[PDB]
Amino acid sequence: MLPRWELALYLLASLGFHFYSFYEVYKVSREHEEELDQEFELETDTLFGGLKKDATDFEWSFWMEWGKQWLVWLLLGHMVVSQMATLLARKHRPWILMLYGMWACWCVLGTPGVAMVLLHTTISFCVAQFRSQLLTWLCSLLLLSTLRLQGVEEVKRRWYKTENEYYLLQFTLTVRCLYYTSFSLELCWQQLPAASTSYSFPWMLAYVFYYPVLHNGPILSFSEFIKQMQQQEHDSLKASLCVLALGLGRLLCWWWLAELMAHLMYMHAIYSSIPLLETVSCWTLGGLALAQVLFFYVKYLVLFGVPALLMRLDGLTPPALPRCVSTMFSFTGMWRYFDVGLHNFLIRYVYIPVGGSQHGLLGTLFSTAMTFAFVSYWCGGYDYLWCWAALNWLGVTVENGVRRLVETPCIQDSLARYFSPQARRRFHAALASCSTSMLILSNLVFLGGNEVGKTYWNRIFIQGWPWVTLSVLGFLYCYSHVGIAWAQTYA
């Protein structure tokens, strides 16, 4: 533990550089408004006194236009149907919710969407009947490559007519992949008598067609699903109403914050203008990076909070929402606390069956590489995704190696006799800053692309090495102190 005045100076410098970089980005946005407008069309609305909105973010624009038309009404329908089923027929709630999910998927994706989901589920089940984990994973990978096939893309774009329904179908099938993979692997591993009646085709269909997580929702474990779907004990509708009220208030606050950021600063258009990235200043560059990561954080708060609220109304325990990215300081912490459901899926079904940290450093290398390669191929398998995956694999490996080297008894006693706990905390903060810079660069390659990545690398670490790099590392050192001091409350 550091003295409180030291910790306060660190937190003060952290908030200072955050807000000054945001102000610089706002200035540059206001200054290049008409050029950015004639290049990318900016939306108008009276929500913020007349400022124009940057609507270049594909995911935000896509999910907002789908939700304002269909998804919010279908989710309200699921809520009321679930409550009526809990009130009238508590034992038939899973099948009632399955029928509602099938009808909603039909209503929003036509007959081909339901047909494709049913086909994938049926094939996965019929292959899981062999009870071979290798064969199950092979079937899942082939079903996932069927999405990456160009001729299949052509046939599906021919199926639909508005070109957003095709993307909705692609995302739905991509998530269904993980869902039926989890089901089939648990079925392959089942050995317990009382668990024999859980892996039936009706249960698989009820798991796959659970509307709160049908299109984009996080990965819910089948164990938790079938545990909650057989409880028979309701949860005090009077308290459900208050849960709903507080969830709606919090979700509206998050949505308003995201819209405020998108109205104030044109981070996405600026990232789309590489000649402008090359000319903006370093404060604006770092502010663009912070704005990107925080907008992604708030966007996924919103995208995951609606399924989480619906699950909490249904009585389930959903995976935890992401921790604020302004408290992450390491690859390991980032990838353990950002996407909890997917992290748990990976740990359970990719990491351990290949062999995790229990079979040596080479086994750890192989398992971590397998996990990140699968994550890249599932996110889409573009070159920038493979680059992001390689950088994150390298970061995780280096952090594991350094931690294992430090936690040896010899070196640990050497440090414990040479340096004070304060000095050890400060050395850990310096290393955490040196790791946080690369974490940010890798995730900027994820968010912007390879050209944005090389621009940031060249302008921060090559062209401005002697002093820009040192300033960035000092700010990240203060930020790392703050994050490490906060991490004790939950680690």
Binding site: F58, E59, F171, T174, L303, D339, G449
Partner: peptide, 7 residues
């Protein structure tokens, strides 16, 4: 998660 395509 999510692909996050650019389009």
């Amino acid at each position: 998660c999510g692909p996050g395509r650019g389009f």
